[PDB]
Symmetry: C2
Subunit: 723 residues, 2 copies
């Protein structure tokens, strides 16, 4: 929180939790990066003169922008490294020369225009530094925005551009931050994946050159999550230096590390410059989304725990932010599309009898929507299928003791829909080109006000028509032929970002209009599982893959950044679907109860003993839900490192914990296995259900001797309680 500027040293010192982030003004208004790491009281701000690194000041051959470590570097006036931003002028030049002009420090944390951002509830929680840079010749101002939190090791960064000149300025690249580390002796971690296998942890040594994760899909994507980290060579889950970079944005991104000839590592992150430009007319401004930067010297768990608390309590919003989330059941595979009102209610009684709390109605309740082909965009209740509308169904579900929820997919329109026939120009498209389809549908142009107003109107008409208290908001394709008939040629490349701004406006309006609704975002599973979406909808469908073994990796990687409260995990029926696997009902429960728990099956196909297990799972999860959704989460064993996965949840006072252990392909006649715990009070004794009493110190330093077992999938869960 404690942000200072020392006029003698011209140094900015941002103290965030137990971390320091230090910058310093250098020569004629350059802004240098000095340090970011464990908190220091002070740090004083060599060899900037290097062969083939040229001199911006002919009178001063002591430095180059090619060697000075910076906060917001440009290319073209002596730095040859990857720039944080680039601007093209009317004369075609791309040379810009920002210098420090002034700064201000204030308590609290500002909102970002049109954008999600971490926030504070009290000014005392953080302090913000704004450093105003300017290129006087062209009238370009860039304000670097920094916030340091008191309680957490969190620095947040963004940049705001403003054209204070009399000419057009075209932003070709506008990243949210850039930081030059003094060495490149780190591994990097990022989170690549695909549909059905999101956010695998990938750790790699750095190369001398560039390495990056990005999305060009108009959505943050299944393929790369907008998160990267630099980690010390020897750092692991429990110890060591880790620097995380998390982009609070749900569209295209670039997350990059470039290592230069002097083995310094430039980390940068922001809206993907690929296929992007932004035109600033005189007087216009551009605000980047923010990047949330976390430091820990307590390994990956230390970093994750920071993100979890920050994101759960100061990014997610609304009535359910700090509330236990309902155990839900999705009633899709009960019917695919095949539905009408008579079934649904008895089904709801069966589900209610098992203790399930929320009944969700899936796709095909609307219009002529009856495969992945039709009526998207026409959001009126198909009053054949539900003649009594949503109201009659919902109210009965409520009188059964369950909440009622609904699926929507408002960003899509079917070529065969009334909306498309009335307004074909309302989809993203480019002149004279075929309109490529994903799952037989097109993308609505949310860069347009009329489109957004129409969606707000139409979805509100549905949501206010029944006592709905949960909505799953799905988006099931990525953008092609990106353009808008409502933008001029010179702004066409703003389409993807304006689309996201439009979606953000729409979601902000929808969640405000319906404060009693828990919204869960979805994009073919976890295709937009990012901090930007979390600001609008406090939980997310983690993956369409609900296979127990597959979920071990998906949940483990997702937890690197995202709080368990946001991480949807459901028990589904087997034969599994994406993969093909058979694991016990017990086992799938064990994996799913390690997330935000729910069900995704046909209850009409269950044996009494199965429903009986489900009744027990539900009762069990209710007992540990506060611990799972709000406790401190520790990863113990990594499925990316072998055949085991293990993790645990610990209460704030360390008096209670829940431990989960998994092993795949356990061999015959195998060595005994052990599990060392973390996060307990070493001087406290704990009762482990079914295993007796152990010292916290015994559990952490010697570990639990795991009951010997062998088989295709071992799954164990234990509750711990201080004696």
């Amino acid at each position: 929180m404690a942000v200072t500027y020392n006029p003698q040293t011209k140094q900015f010192h941002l103290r965030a939790g137990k971390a320091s982030y230090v910058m310093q003004l250098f020569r004629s208004g350059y802004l240098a990066h000095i340090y970011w790491g464990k908190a220091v009281r002070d740090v004083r701000g060599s060899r900037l003169d290097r062969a083939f690194s040229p001199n911006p000041d002919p009178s001063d051959r002591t430095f180059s922008l090619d060697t000075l470590p910076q906060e917001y570097p440009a290319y073209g006036n002596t730095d040859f490294r990857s720039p944080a931003y680039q601007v093209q002028l009317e004369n075609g030049s791309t040379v810009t020369d920002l210098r420090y002009k002034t700064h201000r420090i204030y308590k609290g944390k500002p909102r970002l225009n049109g954008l999600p951002a971490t926030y504070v509830e009290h000014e005392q929680e953080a302090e913000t530094l704004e450093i105003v840079l300017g290129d006087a010749l062209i009238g370009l101002e860039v304000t670097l925005q920094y916030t340091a939190y008191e309680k957490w090791n969190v620095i947040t960064r963004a940049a705001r551009f403003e054209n204070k000149g009399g000419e057009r300025l075209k932003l070709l690249r506008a990243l949210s931050m850039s930081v030059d580390f003094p060495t490149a002796d780190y591994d990097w971690i990022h989170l690549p994946g695909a549909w059905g296998r999101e956010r695998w942890i990938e750790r790699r040594p750095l190369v001398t050159g560039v390495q990056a994760a990005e999305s060009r899909r108009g959505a943050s994507s299944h393929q790369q999550n907008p998160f990267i980290a630099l980690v010390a060579k020897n750092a692991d889950e429990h110890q060591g230096e880790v620097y995380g970079f998390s982009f609070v944005y749900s569209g295209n991104f670039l997350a990059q590390v470039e290592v230069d000839q002097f083995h310094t590592a430039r980390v940068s992150m922001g809206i993907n410059p690929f296929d992007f430009t932004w035109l600033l007319q005189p007087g216009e401004s551009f605000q980047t989304p923010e990047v949330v930067m976390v430091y820990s010297d307590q390994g990956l768990n230390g970093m994750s725990q920071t993100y979890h608390e920050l994101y759960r309590t100061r990014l997610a919003r609304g009535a359910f932010r700090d509330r236990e989330r309902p155990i839900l059941i999705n009633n899709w595979e009960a019917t695919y599309f095949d539905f009408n009102e008579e079934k649904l209610v008895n089904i709801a009684k069966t589900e209610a009898e098992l203790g399930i709390e929320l009944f969700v109605l899936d796709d095909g309740w609307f219009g002529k929507r009856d495969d992945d082909r039709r009526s998207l965009g026409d959001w009126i209740v198909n009053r054949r299928k539900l003649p009594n509308g949503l109201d009659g169904l919902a109210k009965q579900v409520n009188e059964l003791g369950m909440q009622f929820g609904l699926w929507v997919e408002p960003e899509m329109v079917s070529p065969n829909s009334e909306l498309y026939r009335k307004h074909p120009d309302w989809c993203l498209h480019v002149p004279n080109r075929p309109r490529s389809e994903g799952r037989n549908q097109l993308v609505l142009d949310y860069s347009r006000e009329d489109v957004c107003d129409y969606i707000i109107e139409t979805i509100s008409n549905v949501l206010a028509s029944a006592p709905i208290t949960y909505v799953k908001w799905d988006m099931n394709r990525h953008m092609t032929e990106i353009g808008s008939s409502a933008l001029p040629p010179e702004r066409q490349r703003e389409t993807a970002h304006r689309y996201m701004l439009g979606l953000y406006r729409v979601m902000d309006e929808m969640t405000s209009r319906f404060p009693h609704i828990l919204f869960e975002s979805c994009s073919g599973g976890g295709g937009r599982f990012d901090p930007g979406m979390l600001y609008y909808m406090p939980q997310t469908w983690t993956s369409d893959n609900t296979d127990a073994v597959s979920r071990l990796k998906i949940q483990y990687g997702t937890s690197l950044v995202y709080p368990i409260s946001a991480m949807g995990a459901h028990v589904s029926a087997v034969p599994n679907h994406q993969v093909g696997r058979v694991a016990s009902l017990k086992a799938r429960g064990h994996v799913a109860m390690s997330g935000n728990f729910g069900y995704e099956l046909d209850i009409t196909k269950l044996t009494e003993t199965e429903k009986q297990m489900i009744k027990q799972q539900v009762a069990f999860y209710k007992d540990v839900r506060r611990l799972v959704q709000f406790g401190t989460f520790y990863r113990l064993l990594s499925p990316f490192e072998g055949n085991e996965a293990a993790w645990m949840f610990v209460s704030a006072d360390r008096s209670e914990a829940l431990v989960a252990y998994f092993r795949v392909l356990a061999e015959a006649n195998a060595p005994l296995s052990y599990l060392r715990l973390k996060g307990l009070d070493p001087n406290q004794d704990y009762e482990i259900e079914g295993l007796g009493v152990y010292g916290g110190d015994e559990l952490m330093y010697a570990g639990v001797a795991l009951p010997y077992r062998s088989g295709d999938f071992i799954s164990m869960m234990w509750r711990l309680k201080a004696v």
Copy 2:
């Protein structure tokens, strides 16, 4: 050489040496990459349908451009991977849709407009395939150019764009090639470095994401050489699959591997799209430089040996292409700038007595040039320092038995020069911005015809004024504030490439005007050591660092791509300069005689015994020069893998070889060391000077027991001759 198209399968099969490269037409004119590897007689051209990979043809949901492996992919109509090219239309859209139109196959290999390229001397040496692609809507034609050599495992690739429509087309990205490998189970190799330490070999696993080497310096650079390779996980110097990609271009480049969600590896290479655009008015065309693609299953030595033969004999040109290169001495450090005619001649007699063949006159012979500060651009002989001009000095040097050579730096101009005062607009600059300097100098705008004509005129006036037979052409800074007052705003970003085209025109004219001159390119050492420069000047100054130990790495890495004939290596005096090291005259000779050999010292400071060693080194190198410069080169031990370096040269008939061994920091009481040779006839016996007679089989399979030695730097060289 043997290039075919099968109309039944719609498959193109390029047979180059012992390699196959196969492509196939797919659906409505898409061009797919099928295979590249060891030669096959035939190869027949799954799961292109993938979640979130959308369909370009709504009637055909069997594929996506996001999954089809391609030769020249675009972004925007269903491929979300890194595109090979991108074009912006007047309407601001960037969507383009090239489809196959036609193709032609012919014998031989074309020249590339304005550009260097590998060539043939007889049509039988290669065959060329041109595949014509087109986007009918916009009138964009792209011809993919492929050449397959008969004798070598070499495919060369480039693309030629042409606007056959009636609107402006802006190329935002125009890479020379792109290839989608079916897996990413490879390491990559690239050649990062810095001034004084060029082309270190860096081998890294691939990441799921992008990794790239690039230059933004307007020159290929010391920092990254324009070469990358994919290599099998277990491949080494002697065995295993290797795919090399070498860019025949001396300016900005990007060399990239992007691995997608399905673990396919897209390798692409060409002019760096960063800060680049190219405007095509109707009727205009753009030719990319070529990329030379080499396959070997005989490890890195197999690949390198291909590049060496191809580049030495079918890229380098001129009278000296196949000629032994002179042992030269540079007379700089004899005087720094401090010179006049009286010294030079006696010096030349001393040097001639030692057997040195070429006398070179360094910087400061011209104008008011007397530190790294002045008179650059004013290329008239300072007739104080040399009152009898270059002619009198040269002719005397010739009567002493030595050739005479000269240093020039024609791309630079000093702010304090007459040229700059008459034409300040002739430097690269942007309107109203400071002109950043590198070594007190500015860069001439070679994108301008008047500038280029002036240089051709001025340098020719000097070169025709004396019997000069060697020129070192140096360039000692990189481009900043890139722009031209002779281009309109809409073409400003063409400046860097037009500059390089200008330099190429200038060098082509200069080497043609002076066919008796051996030209050696230089850029603060090996700052533009690339195949583009080799086409104009058949050798290159490898590095300004002449330290023996440092050169082990520099020469080892340079040899990965470049023939030893091109690799300048000189013995210099110690205390070494860049580093600070003391190695024996013997040792420095050993490292330098493993390249294109020469001297860089003050002969006036040598002891009789030293000159006596030099006289012996010179005689020795003359004896092995043909073997070193034109023999087959094998790397044996890597200084990137430990404290040893070793390599050898073998004659074409395998009757003669030269072996060199080096070890740094050899410990006391160390294990015995051995060296296994390569490339000999196992059934032949060889005499090793000073070690007796050995079977070729013994030498390769059991190896040489190295004479035990210990010390800071061990250096050994042996001549082998078949008994």
